[PDB]
Design a protein around this ligand. Structure first.
Ligand SMILES: Cc1cc(Nc2nn(-c3ccccc3)c(=O)c3ccccc23)n[nH]1
Length: 249
């Protein structure tokens, strides 16, 4: 099942970063619409990440969920590596946040639910996820979120938990807590103007709520951000949280 660049017609650039950009694309024979991520080989080895990709790509190919961006395949040429990805027409959650400035309780609880489910499923197969950033969350035709990052295994540093910065399976609860906060407030709880300050805030778990955040949200968010991984809830507990069940679609 080997793919080549001439198998596709390349469309408008969807976005860029660091290794390569992403293009809209259509497979010539089937007319199937998808996203083609282009990564430059040279730029990858020079990060010592080339092997990291191989394992993540292998992992992703085996993940099937409605809230996880699908990976159809990959290939390479002399120069570069190409990932064939599901196309998400409504863009990132990051950009939606920039446009709206903050989400209401109903949108937040829905996204958190979709995330929680996607993470449950991963755990079902002994796949655990790293930090999750809004830049890596896409939106499907129906506005359903999709985790688009390759960040599995079997963010510097707004989304990283204390465990990862000081020196799992609980990381993802921490991630939901950061996202849940960011969705309602408009910026992540540990934001600072320098790496050094952010590091301090995360390690101390030092954050405050604006007045408009309701009691229910505060309760869920405060449960998820705990320096100690073992004090964090199960994904199951999150899905049943009264603020969640009341606000979620
Ligand atoms: C991998 C993928 C992307 C995508 N759709 C989109 N991707 N990205 C994007 C932005 C920055 C970096 C990478 C992607 C977009 O800005 C975007 C904007 C509007 C509609 C769709 C997309 N569908 N599938």
């Amino acid at each position: 099942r080997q793919w080549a660049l001439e198998d596709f017609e390349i469309g408008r650039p969807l976005g860029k970063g660091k290794f390569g950009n992403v293009y809209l694309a259509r497979e010539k024979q089937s007319k199937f619409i998808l996203a083609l991520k282009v990564l430059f080989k040279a730029q990858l080895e020079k990060a010592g990440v080339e092997h990291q990709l191989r394992r993540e790509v292998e992992i992703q190919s085996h993940l099937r969920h409605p809230n996880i961006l699908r990976l159809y395949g990959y290939f390479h040429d002399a120069t570069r590596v190409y990932l064939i990805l599901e196309y998400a027409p409504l863009g990132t959650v990051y950009r939606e946040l920039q446009k709206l400035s903050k989400f209401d309780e109903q949108r937040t609880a829905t996204y958190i639910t979709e995330l929680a489910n996607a993470l449950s499923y991963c755990h079902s197969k002994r796949v655990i996820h790293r930090d999750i950033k809004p830049e890596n969350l896409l939106l499907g035709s129906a506005g359903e979120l999709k985790i688009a990052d390759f960040g599995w295994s079997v963010g510097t540093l707004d989304y990283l938990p204390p465990e990862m910065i000081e020196g799992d399976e609980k990381v993802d609860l921490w991630s939901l807590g950061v996202l849940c906060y960011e969705f309602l407030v408009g910026k992540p709880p540990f934001e600072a103007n320098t790496y050094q300050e952010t590091y301090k805030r995360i390690s101390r778990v030092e954050f405050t709520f604006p007045d408009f955040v309701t009691e229910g949200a505060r309760d869920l968010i405060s449960r998820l951000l705990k320096h100690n991984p073992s004090q964090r809830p199960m994904l199951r507990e999150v899905l049943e949280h009264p603020w969640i069940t009341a606000n979620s679609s």
